[PDB]
Design a protein around this ligand. Structure first.
Ligand SMILES: CC(C)C[C@H](N)C(=O)O
Ligand code: NA
Lengths: 64, 385
């Protein structure tokens, strides 16, 4: 099963310098330039965090 | 960059070259720019501001091209709506996209949903020509998937990375047939690629482009044409000689069997055949395979190699890069990524994920399987489903 699509997997939420959020499998090393802000937690929990916390899809550089 | 910037270069270099051919009507680059500036002035005059979304409900025409550029000049993004869509999809797309105004024609006026401003493109109004200007990070368009359709938000930089890509090899002498729905991102090739290259857009006559109409267009001077996979397969099996005279035929989207390409090459030794692959989320196409004149395809039609400026990765279930000949998940990175899905932050975070190969960058999860060849081409290996 694809690791990003495993509804039973353990996940993080990562954010980059542009404020963009990413789901991430908790078993995998966090890529450079990204910071974990939530998890390990269920996939639905992480997606709910993104829905609640990523309110503006525009990259931060655009807004500033 | 932005497509308006690339187009402005062509207006400066050759203002009197033909830009758009629509039946009797012919627009030069200068004429296209001037008309778009006037419609842009009408939009600014109404208070349209940077980042606003303007829906578009028009039949393909020179006015369509003018309208799209005009929305861009006003600092806004276009939301293309096919005039053949049923009313519920039109209404959903307009509301979902946050479009507050809709450009239409006399013929399509009744298709504007109630409560949305109808702007009839042929109406003349007391506003001066003006442009706010397009900027690379700003929204250029919102195009909807074939699924509940999702709104893909694409910035100017990504459209320009696609349209201005040197690999298209479109020249000022080229004439590209325009017939795909402008609500589909193949229209980026049919409209913007020729205009940023100095060539001309030839608006197809109303109705579907079949083999007979393709032959007639080629006789009138069309040099390049895109066909959907379904149409290409049908013409390749039924009348492959109908591509004769084209400099290049392009296709992609759905499955194209190698046999279909082989038939066209057999009938048309000199036509370049470009097979293209890519989701709307990465701006029309991310990889392509070009069969040069005289060359034979062989048993498998690759989806090919990333476009210049783009990267592809084939990773296993632990996100490790696999060796050639091993099937894995296909990820697309580098140029051309959308910002994400409108109103769907979670879905965006689920498919535009962190890219381990480039600091701070994202890659789009295609949901497709692929394998590398030893020489760096990609073979499609089905859906991860
Ligand atoms: C233009 C085609 C190569 C692919 C198109 N972007 C699609 O998603 O169907
Ligand atoms: Na996709």
């Amino acid at each position: 099963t694809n690791p990003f699509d495993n509804e039973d997997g353990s996940f993080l939420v990562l954010v980059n310098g542009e404020g963009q959020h990413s789901l991430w499998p908790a078993f995998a090393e966090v890529p450079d330039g990204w910071t974990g802000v939530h998890g390990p937690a269920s996939r639905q929990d992480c997606l709910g965090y993104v829905e609640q916390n990523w309110t503006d899809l525009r990259p931060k550089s655009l807004i500033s | 960059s932005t497509v308006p910037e690339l187009l402005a270069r062509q207006v400066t270099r050759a203002p009197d070259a033909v830009a758009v051919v629509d039946r009797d009507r012919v627009l030069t680059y200068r004429e296209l720019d001037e008309l778009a500036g006037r419609l842009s002035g009408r939009l600014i005059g109404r208070g349209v501001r940077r980042g606003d979304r303007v829906a578009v409900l028009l039949d393909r025409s020179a006015d369509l091209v003018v309208t799209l550029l005009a929305i861009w000049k006003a600092g806004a993004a276009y939301v293309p709506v096919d005039a053949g869509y049923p009313a519920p999809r039109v209404a959903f797309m307009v509301a979902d996209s946050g479009a507050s105004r809709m450009v239409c024609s006399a013929a399509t006026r009744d298709g504007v949903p109630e409560g949305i401003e109808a702007i009839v493109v042929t109406d003349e109004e007391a506003f001066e020509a003006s442009a706010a200007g397009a900027r690379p990070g700003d929204l250029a368009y919102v195009m909807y998937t074939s699924g509940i359709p999702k709104g893909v938000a694409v910035p100017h930089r990504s459209v320009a990375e696609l349209a201005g890509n040197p690999g298209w090899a479109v020249e000022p002498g080229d004439a590209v047939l325009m017939h795909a729905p402008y609500a589909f991102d193949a229209s980026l090739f049919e409209i913007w690629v020729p205009l940023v290259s100095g060539g001309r857009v030839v608006i197809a006559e109303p109705g579907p482009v079949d083999a007979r109409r393709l032959r007639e267009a080629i006789s009138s001077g069309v040099t390049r044409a895109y066909l959907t996979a379904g149409s290409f397969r049908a013409v390749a099996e039924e009348s492959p000689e109908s591509f004769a005279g084209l400099r290049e035929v392009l296709t992609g989207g759905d499955v194209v069997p190698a046999h279909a390409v082989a038939r066209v090459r057999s009938a048309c030794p000199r036509v370049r055949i470009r097979h293209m692959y890519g989701p709307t989320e990465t701006t029309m196409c991310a990889t392509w395979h070009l069969l040069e004149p005289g060359d034979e395809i062989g048993p498998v039609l690759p989806i090919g190699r990333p476009l210049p400026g783009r990267r592809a990765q084939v990773l296993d279930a632990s996100l490790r890069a696999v060796a050639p000949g091993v099937i894995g998940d296909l990820y697309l990175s580098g140029a051309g990524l959308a910002d994400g899905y409108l109103r769907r932050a979670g879905l965006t975070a689920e498919r535009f994920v962190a890219d381990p190969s480039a600091p701070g960058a994202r890659m789009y999860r295609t949901g497709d399987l692929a394998q590398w060849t030893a020489d760096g081409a990609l073979l499609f290996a089905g859906r991860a489903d």
